[PDB]
Amino acid sequence: YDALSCKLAAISVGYLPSSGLQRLSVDLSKKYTEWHRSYLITLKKFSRRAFGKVDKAMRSSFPVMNYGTYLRTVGIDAAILEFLVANEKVQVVNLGCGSDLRMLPLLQMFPHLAYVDIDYNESVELKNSILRESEILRISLGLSKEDTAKSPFLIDQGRYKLAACDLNDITETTRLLDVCTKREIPTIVISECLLCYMHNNESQLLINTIMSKFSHGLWISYDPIGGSQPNDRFGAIMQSNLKESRNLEMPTLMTYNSKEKYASRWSAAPNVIVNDMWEIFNAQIPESERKRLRSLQFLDELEELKVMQTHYILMKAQW
Q1: Options 3.40.225.10, 3.40.50.300, 3.30.70.20, 3.40.50.150; which CATH number does 1-319 get?
Q2: Strands 160-164 and 113-119, sheet pairing
Q3: Does the N-terminal peptide bond of residue 270 adopt cis geometry, omega within 30 degrees of 0?
Q4: Cβ distance 266 to 260 under 8 Å?
Q5: 3-state class (DSSP) for residue 218
Q6: Residues 58, 63, 68, 71: is their CA dihedral positive or negative?
Q7: Residue 94 — φ and ψ, nearest 5°?
Q8: Residue 282 to residues 22, 82, 289: CA-CA distances in angstroms?
Q9: Helix ranges restricted to H, 111-246
Q10: Strand, helix or coil at 43?
Q11: What angle separates helix 200-213 from helix 170-180, to the nearest 10 degrees?
Q12: How far apart are CA 233 and CA 243, in angstroms?
């Protein structure tokens, strides 16, 4: 599990939590680490294979990757937190949520936040198993150990829902949203490395339909881009590598190969901001953080980080 292993490595080294950017208290900073660590331990209980993959990935993590993971996490978190502070009563829809645990601090931090995690069936089933099995995670969500909830939810517990959905099926997705969100509540939609795996029709229809479901909101999307400069082999190498290692495809990676082309998918939104992660590193990350991260590992090859991070974007679309 790429994202989880990246997260846990960054946490292990100490990149995360970043209490300032993630706006975490002393106790939530501690919990942030504990929750993730428990997630890993509990994953191990449920899958030797997944645990092994994560373990191996974590041990071989390198500084450039860890900076990537840091930037991704604090970039999204900073966007989320700005909007949450401005909008006391809000709903977050995390599309393709995977092992993301941001609901744990956020639900605590924001008493009137409702959060919906949506992913494909197998993913949400494993997440539900893990959240319910781990005592610390169960307790943070006020869950029972045995699978209480009723279809269409695996968890439907206070202000958190966890639901299976085929996000390539937009009728299913809209009907699901109908029963767990309200049109008139400010909505954050999160798609972190979700749309990169979708064909353009599905991702465009998902974008259009979901934005149209909510009077006002913020869509935060994070994804790779193929690269716009001539003879940039990033997309080709990624598309190649995905095809052998994961059998997966990124159908629109070369279509949306610049941050501008990527952001244009949200052009129905009046306010669209897009940055590559290198820009975020240089403009959004305080000197104190840059210094702190330099204390952790040797980033000997800053150009390599730049090359990688200029192929990841954080798109914020508001309406």
Answers
A1: 3.40.50.150
A2: parallel
A3: no
A4: no
A5: strand
A6: positive
A7: -100, 105
A8: 17, 19, 11
A9: 121-133, 135-141, 170-180, 200-213, 234-245
A10: helix
A11: 20
A12: 15
Residues annotated as binding site for S-adenosyl-L-methionine?
72, 96, 119, 166-168, 192
For residues 225 and 186, the answer to whether their CB atoms sit within 8 Å is no
Lookup: tokens for 235: 């997309």
Please state the residue numbers annotated as binding site.
Answer: 72, 96, 119, 166-168, 192
Strand partners, 312: 224
> Hey, how many other C-beta atoms are within 10 angstroms of the C-beta on 47?
16
Which pair of structure tokens corresponds to residue 37? Answer: 């660590």
Resolution (A): 1.9
Domain positions in the chain are 1-319
Strands 187-192 and 217-224: parallel
DSSP-derived 3-state class of residue 184: coil
The answer to whether 239 touches 227, Cβ cutoff 8 Å, is: no
Number of Cβ within 10 Å of residue 278's Cβ equals 18
**Residues 185, 90 contacting (CB under 8 angstroms):** yes
Give the closest residue to 203 by CA, choosing from 311, 279, 287, 315.
315
Question: With b meaning 16 or more CB within 10 Å and e meaning fewer, what string describes 300-312?
Answer: eeeeebbebbbbb
State the Cα–Cα distance between residues 266 and 113, nearest whole angstrom. Answer: 24
Distance separating alpha carbons of residues 128 and 313, to the nearest angstrom: 29
How was this structure determined? It was done by X-ray
- Burial class of residue 171 in the structure, from the number of CB atoms within 10 Å of its CB (0-12 exposed, 13-18 middle, 19+ buried): exposed
Nearest C-alpha neighbor of 100 from the set 72, 67, 65, 133:
72
Cα–Cα distance, 114 to 159 (Å, whole number): 5
For 33, other C-beta atoms within 10 Å of its C-beta total 17
